[PDB]
C-alpha cells in the first residue's frame, strides 16, 4: 500500500495565485476519500459528476489537484458554467470532480498586508487553461501608460475584512478516467 499525498496538498503552507494555480498530478497511490468528507474544516464542499459518498470505492487513471487562492464570495466562480472575473479570466460544464474551498485568513492575510488575480484579458479562458492590456486604438509598445496598464491587480487580504472579502484556498479534485490502468482507490 502507498497512500496518496492528499495531506500535503490540502495542508501546503503557501499556495499560488489564482492566475498561476499549480496543477498537481497525483497517481500510483491509494486515496482515502473519507478524510476529505469527514473533516468539518471546510467552508464549502460540493460537486457533481460522481457520488460524493460512494466515491471511495471507485478508481481512475490519474488525479489532478488544482490549488489557488480567491476571495470568500468568489467561491461561486469555481463551479462549472460560471460568469465572473475569476471564472472567465483565471471548469467545463462536463466536469466530473469536486471543488474544496476553506478559509485562509490566518495564513494569507497579515496585519501589515501580505498582498502576495488577473483583471484584463482579450479572450475568455478556455477550460483548464491558465494565463500567466490594450483598451483602445493606441498600440502601446510596452509602456504601461495612457489606455494601457498592467493586467494584474494584487489581492488585498486583511483579517479586518468580512467573511466574503477574506482569502480562501481552493483545491479542485479533477479525476480523469482515460482508457489507461486505474491505480487510485481505497
Amino acid at each position, epitope marked *: 500500500t502507498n497512500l496518496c499525498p492528499f495531506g*500535503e496538498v490540502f495542508n501546503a503552507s503557501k499556495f499560488a495565485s489564482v492566475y498561476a494555480w499549480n496543477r498537481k498530478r497525483i497517481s500510483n497511490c491509494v486515496a482515502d476519500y473519507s478524510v476529505l468528507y469527514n473533516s468539518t474544516s471546510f467552508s464549502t464542499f460540493k460537486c457533481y459528476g460522481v457520488s460524493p459518498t460512494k466515491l471511495n470505492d471507485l478508481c481512475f487513471t490519474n488525479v489532478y489537484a488544482d490549488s489557488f487562492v480567491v476571495k470568500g464570495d468568489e467561491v461561486r466562480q469555481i463551479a462549472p458554467g460560471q460568469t465572473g472575473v475569476i471564472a472567465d479570466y483565471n471548469l467545463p460544464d462536463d466536469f466530473t470532480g469536486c471543488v474544496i474551498a476553506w478559509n485562509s485568513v490566518k*495564513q494569507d492575510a497579515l496585519t501589515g498586508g501580505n498582498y502576495g488575480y488577473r483583471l484584463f484579458r482579450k479572450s475568455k479562458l478556455k477550460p483548464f487553461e491558465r494565463d500567466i492590456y490594450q483598451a483602445g486604438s493606441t498600440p502601446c509598445n510596452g509602456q504601461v501608460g495612457l489606455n494601457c496598464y498592467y493586467p494584474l491587480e494584487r489581492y488585498g487580504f486583511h483579517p479586518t475584512t468580512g467573511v466574503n472579502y477574506q482569502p480562501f484556498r481552493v483545491v479542485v479534485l479533477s479525476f480523469e478516467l482515460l482508457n489507461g490502468p486505474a491505480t487510485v482507490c481505497g
Partner: antibody, heavy 125, light 108 residues
Framework: QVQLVQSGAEVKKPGASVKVSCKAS????????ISWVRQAPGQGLEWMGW????????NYAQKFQGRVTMTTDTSTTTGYMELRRSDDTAVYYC????????????????????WGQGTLVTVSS | EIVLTQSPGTLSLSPGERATLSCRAS???????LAWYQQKPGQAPRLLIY???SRATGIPDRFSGSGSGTDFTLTISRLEPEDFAVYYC????????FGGGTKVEIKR
C-alpha cells in the same frame, strides 16, 4: 498512537562515524518524512537535516553539507542517520516531519511530532 | 538565515501565574512556518503549536500561540507543575532554524 524507537547509545573516538536507526509504527511510513535534530549537553536544539520516505530526497543543514548521510528503508519503516568529532558529542533525536512533505517536497503546515527517545552519542579519545 | 532570538533566556514564575514566552525572528517568517516545542528535562521534545496558532493533537488548552510577521508569542494561561520545562521556537520559512530556548523556572 505512533511511537518512534531509536538505537541504543553508541560511543566512538574522533575517527569513523556512528549510525542510528529509527523504526516507526502507527502511521504510513511513506506518507510523512523524517527529520533529525542534534542537542549537545547543556545546549539547545540544533537541526541536522530532512529526508523524504517516498522519493528519498534529502535536505541536510548547511553545517553538514558534505558530512551527514541519511537513508530510509521503505520495508522496515526505519530511518537511518550517519555523520561522517568531540565537538559533535550530543544526543541525536529522531522525529516525524510535517514541514516539507514526503511526496512532492513543498513546505507544509506543521512541525515535528512524535520524537524518538534520542540516541546518546559521545565522541572522546 | 532567519535567526530566532528568544528572550528572556530563563523565565521564573510561581505555579498559577501566566507566562508569555516570545520568539523573535531576524527576518519576516511566514505565519504558517513556525512551531513551538516543549522539552521536559531528561526527555524528548514535544510539539506544542504549529502554524503559530494551531496546537498539536493532545496538547492542552492553556498553551495558546500567536504572533505574525517578526514577533511571535507562546502563552501559558495557567502554569502547571508539569509545564516547567525548556521551550523552543522553530521556523521553516527559509531552510530550518531553532531557537536558543526559554527555560521556565519555578519561583519560590
Amino acid at each position: 498512537q505512533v511511537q518512534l524507537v531509536q538505537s541504543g547509545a553508541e560511543v566512538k573516538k574522533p575517527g569513523a562515524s556512528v549510525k542510528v536507526s529509527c523504526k516507526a509504527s502507527g502511521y504510513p511510513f511513506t506518507s510523512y518524512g523524517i527529520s533529525w535534530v542534534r542537542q549537545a549537553p547543556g545546549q539547545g536544539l540544533e537541526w541536522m537535516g530532512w529526508i523524504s520516505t517516498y522519493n528519498g530526497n534529502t535536505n541536510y543543514a548547511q553545517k553538514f553539507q558534505g558530512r551527514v548521510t541519511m537513508t530510509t528503508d521503505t520495508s522496515t519503516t526505519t530511518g537511518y542517520m550517519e555523520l561522517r568529532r568531540s565537538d559533535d558529542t550530543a544526543v541525536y533525536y529522531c522525529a516525524r516531519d510535517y514541514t516539507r512533505g514526503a511526496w512532492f517536497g513543498e513546505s507544509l503546515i506543521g512541525g515535528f511530532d512524535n520524537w524518538g527517545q534520542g540516541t546518546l552519542v559521545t565522541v572522546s579519545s | 538565515e532567519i535567526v530566532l532570538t528568544q528572550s528572556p533566556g530563563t523565565l521564573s514564575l510561581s505555579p498559577g501565574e501566566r507566562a508569555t514566552l516570545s520568539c523573535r525572528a531576524s527576518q519576516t517568517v511566514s505565519s504558517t512556518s513556525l512551531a513551538w516545542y516543549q522539552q521536559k528535562p531528561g526527555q524528548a521534545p514535544r510539539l506544542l503549536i504549529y502554524g503559530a496558532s494551531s496546537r498539536a493533537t493532545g496538547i492542552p488548552d492553556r498553551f495558546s500561540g500567536s504572533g505574525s510577521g517578526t514577533d511571535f508569542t507562546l502563552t501559558i494561561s495557567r502554569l502547571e507543575p508539569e509545564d516547567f520545562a525548556v521551550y523552543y521556537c522553530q521556523q521553516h520559512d527559509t531552510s530550518l532554524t531553532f531557537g536558543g530556548g526559554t527555560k521556565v523556572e519555578i519561583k519560590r
